[PDB]
Design a protein around this motif. Structure first.
Motif, mmCIF file in Angstrom:
data_model
loop_
_atom_site.group_PDB
_atom_site.id
_atom_site.type_symbol
_atom_site.label_atom_id
_atom_site.label_comp_id
_atom_site.label_asym_id
_atom_site.label_seq_id
_atom_site.Cartn_x
_atom_site.Cartn_y
_atom_site.Cartn_z
ATOM 1 N N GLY A 1 42.234 83.127 -23.172
ATOM 2 C CA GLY A 1 42.236 83.583 -24.473
ATOM 3 C C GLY A 1 43.470 82.922 -25.379
ATOM 4 O O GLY A 1 43.248 82.741 -26.629
ATOM 5 N N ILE A 2 44.197 82.417 -24.730
ATOM 6 C CA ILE A 2 45.461 81.421 -25.174
ATOM 7 C C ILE A 2 44.755 80.240 -25.726
ATOM 8 O O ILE A 2 44.939 79.729 -26.788
ATOM 9 N N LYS A 3 44.015 79.584 -24.911
ATOM 10 C CA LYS A 3 43.482 78.369 -25.008
ATOM 11 C C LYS A 3 42.395 78.665 -26.251
ATOM 12 O O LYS A 3 42.190 77.623 -27.011
ATOM 13 N N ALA A 4 41.508 79.653 -26.283
ATOM 14 C CA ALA A 4 40.566 79.972 -27.424
ATOM 15 C C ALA A 4 41.279 79.979 -28.534
ATOM 16 O O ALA A 4 40.746 79.448 -29.615
ATOM 17 N N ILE A 5 42.388 80.883 -28.801
ATOM 18 C CA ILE A 5 42.899 81.036 -30.040
ATOM 19 C C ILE A 5 43.707 79.488 -30.647
ATOM 20 O O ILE A 5 44.019 79.466 -31.839
ATOM 21 N N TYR A 6 44.220 78.943 -29.575
ATOM 22 C CA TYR A 6 44.917 77.563 -29.837
ATOM 23 C C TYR A 6 43.618 76.440 -30.104
ATOM 24 O O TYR A 6 44.094 75.334 -30.603
ATOM 25 N N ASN A 7 42.512 76.969 -29.890
ATOM 26 C CA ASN A 7 41.336 75.884 -29.849
ATOM 27 C C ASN A 7 41.753 74.680 -29.135
ATOM 28 O O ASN A 7 41.343 73.555 -29.609
ATOM 29 N N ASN A 8 42.400 74.918 -27.875
ATOM 30 C CA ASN A 8 42.682 73.639 -27.048
ATOM 31 C C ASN A 8 42.462 73.982 -25.536
ATOM 32 O O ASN A 8 43.205 74.779 -25.014
ATOM 33 N N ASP A 9 41.571 73.399 -24.919
ATOM 34 C CA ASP A 9 40.967 73.754 -23.690
ATOM 35 C C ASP A 9 41.874 73.264 -22.941
ATOM 36 O O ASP A 9 41.798 73.535 -21.352
ATOM 37 N N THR A 10 43.096 72.363 -23.121
ATOM 38 C CA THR A 10 43.756 71.552 -22.170
ATOM 39 C C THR A 10 45.362 71.860 -22.689
ATOM 40 O O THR A 10 46.238 71.152 -22.418
ATOM 41 N N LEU A 11 45.427 72.934 -23.402
ATOM 42 C CA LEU A 11 46.802 73.387 -24.085
ATOM 43 C C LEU A 11 47.849 73.605 -22.766
ATOM 44 O O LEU A 11 47.287 74.268 -21.729
ATOM 45 N N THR A 12 48.903 73.117 -22.819
ATOM 46 C CA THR A 12 49.856 73.162 -21.433
ATOM 47 C C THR A 12 51.055 74.177 -21.582
ATOM 48 O O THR A 12 51.655 74.763 -20.807
ATOM 49 N N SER A 13 51.275 74.462 -23.379
ATOM 50 C CA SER A 13 52.387 75.417 -23.600
ATOM 51 C C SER A 13 51.896 75.796 -25.012
ATOM 52 O O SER A 13 51.507 75.168 -25.744
ATOM 53 N N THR A 14 52.638 77.053 -25.332
ATOM 54 C CA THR A 14 52.468 77.460 -26.741
ATOM 55 C C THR A 14 53.834 77.243 -27.437
ATOM 56 O O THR A 14 54.778 76.618 -26.473
ATOM 57 N N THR A 15 53.692 77.599 -28.685
ATOM 58 C CA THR A 15 55.154 77.363 -29.676
ATOM 59 C C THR A 15 54.933 78.186 -30.639
ATOM 60 O O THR A 15 53.946 78.760 -31.053
ATOM 61 N N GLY A 16 56.120 78.485 -31.273
ATOM 62 C CA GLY A 16 56.394 79.353 -32.529
ATOM 63 C C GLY A 16 56.930 80.631 -32.620
ATOM 64 O O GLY A 16 56.671 81.223 -31.471
ATOM 65 N N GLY A 17 56.965 81.298 -33.611
ATOM 66 C CA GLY A 17 57.227 82.615 -33.900
ATOM 67 C C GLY A 17 58.836 82.814 -34.089
ATOM 68 O O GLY A 17 59.088 84.038 -34.310
ATOM 69 N N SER A 18 59.747 81.804 -34.222
ATOM 70 C CA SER A 18 61.075 82.102 -34.334
ATOM 71 C C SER A 18 61.237 82.789 -35.577
ATOM 72 O O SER A 18 60.893 82.512 -36.657
ATOM 73 N N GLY A 19 62.329 83.840 -35.287
ATOM 74 C CA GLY A 19 62.742 84.768 -36.345
ATOM 75 C C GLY A 19 62.003 86.095 -36.767
ATOM 76 O O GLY A 19 62.346 86.873 -37.315
ATOM 77 N N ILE A 20 60.724 85.938 -36.078
ATOM 78 C CA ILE A 20 59.853 87.133 -36.514
ATOM 79 C C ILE A 20 59.945 87.957 -35.348
ATOM 80 O O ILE A 20 59.932 87.792 -34.126
ATOM 81 N N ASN A 21 59.952 89.354 -35.523
ATOM 82 C CA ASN A 21 59.844 90.405 -34.589
ATOM 83 C C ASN A 21 58.804 90.942 -34.519
ATOM 84 O O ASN A 21 57.922 91.295 -35.594
ATOM 85 N N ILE A 22 58.182 90.958 -33.343
ATOM 86 C CA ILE A 22 57.184 91.679 -32.814
ATOM 87 C C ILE A 22 57.356 93.086 -32.345
ATOM 88 O O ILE A 22 57.904 93.100 -31.144
ATOM 89 N N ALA A 23 57.038 94.305 -32.933
ATOM 90 C CA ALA A 23 57.476 95.591 -32.446
ATOM 91 C C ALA A 23 55.950 96.105 -31.734
ATOM 92 O O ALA A 23 54.908 96.389 -32.502
ATOM 93 N N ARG B 1 54.289 81.351 -9.414
ATOM 94 C CA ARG B 1 54.139 82.779 -9.592
ATOM 95 C C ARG B 1 52.780 83.247 -10.386
ATOM 96 O O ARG B 1 52.383 84.303 -10.133
ATOM 97 N N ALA B 2 52.439 82.284 -11.306
ATOM 98 C CA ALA B 2 51.336 82.570 -12.375
ATOM 99 C C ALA B 2 49.937 81.790 -11.852
ATOM 100 O O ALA B 2 49.987 80.511 -11.493
ATOM 101 N N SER B 3 48.990 82.371 -11.694
ATOM 102 C CA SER B 3 47.673 81.938 -11.482
ATOM 103 C C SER B 3 47.150 81.032 -12.468
ATOM 104 O O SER B 3 46.275 80.002 -12.094
ATOM 105 N N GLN B 4 47.346 81.356 -13.802
ATOM 106 C CA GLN B 4 47.119 80.376 -15.059
ATOM 107 C C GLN B 4 48.188 80.847 -15.775
ATOM 108 O O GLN B 4 48.586 81.858 -16.488
ATOM 109 N N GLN B 5 49.150 79.431 -16.189
ATOM 110 C CA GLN B 5 49.875 79.711 -17.025
ATOM 111 C C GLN B 5 49.414 79.954 -18.599
ATOM 112 O O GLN B 5 50.080 80.287 -19.432
ATOM 113 N N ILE B 6 48.068 79.368 -18.883
ATOM 114 C CA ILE B 6 47.477 79.230 -20.059
ATOM 115 C C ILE B 6 46.215 80.144 -20.012
ATOM 116 O O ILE B 6 45.363 79.452 -19.760
ATOM 117 N N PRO B 7 46.199 81.647 -20.051
ATOM 118 C CA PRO B 7 45.143 82.408 -19.905
ATOM 119 C C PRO B 7 43.793 81.653 -20.871
ATOM 120 O O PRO B 7 44.149 81.070 -21.955
#
Ligand SMILES: [Ca+2]
Ligand SMILES: [Ca+2]
Ligand SMILES: [Ca+2]
Ligand SMILES: [Ca+2]
Ligand SMILES: [Ca+2]
Length: 309
Positions: A9-31, A1-7
């Protein structure tokens, strides 16, 4: 379903051109204060926690937050899409964060200032009621500084909420930054494009610029850009399922609010001011030098720089 699972900008902010998944944020609410969010999207459903509408005849309207535009769903997915329960979807910056989908914009993409202010205050009241750390993310603004919204931002900041908002898309002339981004108590986010100039990412031409007089000191006054993030050609979740690619400071904003959630979840005792300082120091360490007005150091195109993981 996704053409890029890791767009890009996600690679750029993670500074990892071969990033395959992201992680983090548990317990924080983003409104995400926006056009609503597609609550059943595969890549968001695991994180939906609140769904409220501020655009109707009474307020809030609980258990209602339908996106008929796409903008709000797209922003939410950049901040916190989790790949879905089959891991076949898109990942946002903070895939373990909670989403509070607060509809403050009509389906047209435009919203009334009283509704926006009410939602900002409500998010703060919910942070207080629940005892949980909350980031308000506003991919919206205006050239004018509405006092209902300003006062609401102050109220929220006083309650311990972090506020992140788009710089605006009226660039590249000096002094085009809009509100609420330009408020001292909001983190204004400039948009990067996936182009290098002067050895760094380049600020997009459309991204609204701050002011010469107060840039350069690495201290935020009214009118200052703060943090740059990917904003052009951003693939994310869409309102009727699937995905879409749109551009703007609207897309840059959730990269920063997601990064802030990732950092806050790593370091959950921080105050909002301390979290802001951490984000500012991350940005300072990645000086942006490309795009009109961009310079060595803190500048009115890119603010302090590009905060990364
Ligand atoms: Ca929560
Ligand atoms: Ca209204
Ligand atoms: Ca600001
Ligand atoms: Ca300044
Ligand atoms: Ca710079």
């Amino acid at each position: 379903r996704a053409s890029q699972q890791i767009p890009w900008g996600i690679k750029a902010i993670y500074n990892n051109d071969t990033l395959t998944s992201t992680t983090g944020g548990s317990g924080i609410n983003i409104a995400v204060l926006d056009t609503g969010v597609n609550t059943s999207h595969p890549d968001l459903v695991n994180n939906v926690e609140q769904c409220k509408d501020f655009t109707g005849a009474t307020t809030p309207i609980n258990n209602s937050c339908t996106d008929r535009n796409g903008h709000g769903t797209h922003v939410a997915g950049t901040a916190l899409a989790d790949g879905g329960s089959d891991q076949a979807g898109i990942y946002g910056v903070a895939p373990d964060a909670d989403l509070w989908a607060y509809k403050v914009l009509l389906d047209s993409g435009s919203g009334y200032s009283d509704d926006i202010a009410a939602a900002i205050r409500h998010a703060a009241d919910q942070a207080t009621a629940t005892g949980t750390k909350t980031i308000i993310s506003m991919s919206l603004g205006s050239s004018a500084n509405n006092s209902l919204i300003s006062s609401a931002v102050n109220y929220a900041y006083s309650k311990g909420v972090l506020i992140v908002a788009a710089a605006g898309n009226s660039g590249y002339s000096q002094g085009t930054i809009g509100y609420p981004g330009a408020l001292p108590n909001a983190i204004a986010v400039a948009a990067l494009e996936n182009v290098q100039q002067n050895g760094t990412y380049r600020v997009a031409d459309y991204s609204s610029r701050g002011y010469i007089s107060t840039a350069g000191d690495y201290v935020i006054q009214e009118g200052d850009i703060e943090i740059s993030a990917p904003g052009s050609s951003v693939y994310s979740t869409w309102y009727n399922g699937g995905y879409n690619t749109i551009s703007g400071t609207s897309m840059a904003t959730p990269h920063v609010s997601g990064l802030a959630a990732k950092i806050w979840a790593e370091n959950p005792s921080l105050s909002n001011t301390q979290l802001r300082s951490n984000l500012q120091e991350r940005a300072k360490s990645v000086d942006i030098k490309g795009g009109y007005g961009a310079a060595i150091g803190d500048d009115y195109a890119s603010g302090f720089g590009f905060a990364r993981v």
